[PDB]
Ligand binder design. Structure first.
Ligand SMILES: [Au+3]
Ligand SMILES: [Au+3]
Ligand SMILES: [Au+3]
Ligand SMILES: [Au+3]
Lengths: 209, 209, 209, 209
């Protein structure tokens, strides 16, 4: 790699062919639609939860990804380490507007399930979600005693699903919901970053914070 | 304005909520559609024609916009000064793909009409448009003996209209055609630059050249 | 604010007049220079420590900035909450290259001092800093029993000082050290973001992670 | 190439390590310096002259670069086709400020020399350069009866040289002048675009128009 690589104005101005949207544009698209169920992935969608995953990796598996299969890690992660997770502004704006519409708010996560969890409380508190609009976090996956994310979206009739990962968008696509992408922050520890827009889906501008 | 204004990473990463598209995405959206009529604005859409407008302003009205109402200017502009106009790559790609589809290609301009014009020839030659797909330039406007751009789009059943100006997009919208925006080059002499995306329309990436 | 604000190619290509540098360019500028003392601010320079500050604000002063004057907060912050702080890649690269040069590495922070601190250990461990190159964190400020950041830079003959805040750069300028700016992440809770480049200083590219 | 390539926020925020400067910063760097000689390359530095080169290629060598060795082309190019060349705003600002300083303004070009030329007049007129600050265009090169660009910079004691091409910057470097880069417009017909910043030189922001 050159010490002085330089640049040019074609590169400076270059845009990826992404369907960017704003929160205001999403709300406009819903004007006059009755209350409905909507859903949010948690990690890197509404919470920057890398601090707990970082601590977990360092504590339980410094030299691998084994911590993510370790029940001792998940018990810590789901019962208080989200006190260190930083709520995303894009999520504050989306949740506020869905609450204003009278929509039902679901959170659906791929985190491993635990005996108890305080994540639902962390979310309702941080985002000021009235109990009437709030629903306990859904721990979705392919383990016995679980339903997949796509199945939960169908079951709860979720019409819009927000998320940062490819599998969030394809879950929405599989059930005919509108999948809307949020950008994963570049300081997330979950790498590589996804290619937001990879399915031709809407991607929310400036949604990394 | 500060000598050293600085910047920050929210600004560096900030995106306008624009529906960007590529030529390949447009072509995909048309896959399996039968031949149809499509249309292109000329100036700053398919030709960088500022060289002739610049020369015209300097020659006929250095201190005003009067040259644009001067028949002597339009006679020069429409009968050879497009030899100095630079065809846009985005237009080469779009016209090639529409020709491949067997589509009919129309050009519709707000330039003032003249006794003769060699612009139609310049376009067919520069863009390698077979005579079978080519149509003489339509000089549209609100003068007596003219029809407006919107009327021509209806009359010719033009289904897609490409252009750089707000009035290109709103003409398409008025007749229910798909208006697709091309970016005006920042070295155009026609200023201010339009706000591409101002109607929520598709905007072609990297279309300034 | 317009629903569809649009954009134009002058805006898309616009650059702030910033002296950007890479880590490789900094290292080249130092080639053949003997070992020297260099220094780093901690928060948003080498650690994304917003998780602990976020938890602190929520715990000790949800409705104000009083937590930052609260000794109970600082005891938690400096004695373990950096387990949740995320080391920045730019800092890994800079520290690795300074260690390679045989340079002495100092960390100078405006955090309030506490009875004990485990931040120095967190830094040496996370960044793999050999004990020979490592120095205990300097808690600088204007309280009695403290020296200011500028005084410490003089005292330790620190030749390069990295940091994200205006006061990091002006501290370096005051003592004739080379102040180099790192970008604060847009998901930091410490807002507004600084104007990196505001003193005409070098700013490291892509340094938000 | 994927239909929907997507993007991510590391890419969106990524910056090349370029030393960007503004016109105001350049002027500040010269404050209190006595009048001096400065120089400008012409093509894609002060004039967007692609219209004439485009017409020339089409007229004299549609299927090659031979037009550039054709004296009939150069006679047209240098004796009136710059009426269609579009002056760059960055050049207006630089020339205005150098004229304000009382500096001597030279233009040095690699265009082939002709019996007569009207380019010097076009430049003085377009840029409002007082006769006292203006100098006839220097046609530099390696043909017999010529001196190279570097030799002219030495001969005229030119202290700052502005240009868009690598050879403009390296000419300045060879004689110890300050070479400052202007961005070539992406709709120039002279491709590929140069890597502005490739020598670690200053590059003027927004200088493509
Ligand atoms: Au996620
Ligand atoms: Au137009
Ligand atoms: Au800091
Ligand atoms: Au040039």
């Amino acid at each position: 790699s050159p010490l002085n690589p330089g640049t040019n104005v074609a590169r400076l101005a270059e845009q990826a062919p992404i369907h960017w949207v704003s929160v205001a544009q999403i709300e406009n698209s819903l004007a006059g639609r009755p209350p409905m169920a909507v859903g949010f992935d948690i990690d890197d969608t509404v919470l920057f939860s890398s601090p707990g995953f970082w601590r977990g990796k360092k504590t339980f598996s410094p030299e691998s990804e084994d911590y993510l299969k370790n029940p001792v890690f998940w018990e810590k992660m789901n019962n208080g380490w989200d006190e260190f997770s930083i709520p995303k502004e894009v999520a504050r704006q989306l949740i506020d507007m869905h609450v204003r519409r009278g929509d039902a708010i679901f959170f659906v996560t791929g985190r491993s399930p635990t005996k108890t969890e305080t994540v639902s409380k962390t979310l309702a508190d941080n985002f000021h979600i009235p109990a009437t609009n709030m629903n306990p976090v859904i721990f979705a996956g392919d383990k016995p005693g679980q339903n997949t994310k796509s199945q939960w979206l169908q079951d709860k009739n979720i019409r819009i699903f927000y998320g940062d990962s490819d599998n969030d968008i394809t879950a929405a696509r599989d059930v005919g919901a509108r999948g809307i992408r949020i950008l994963r922050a570049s300081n997330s520890t979950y790498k590589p970053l996804p290619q937001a827009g990879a399915f031709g889906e809407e991607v929310i501008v400036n949604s990394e914070y």
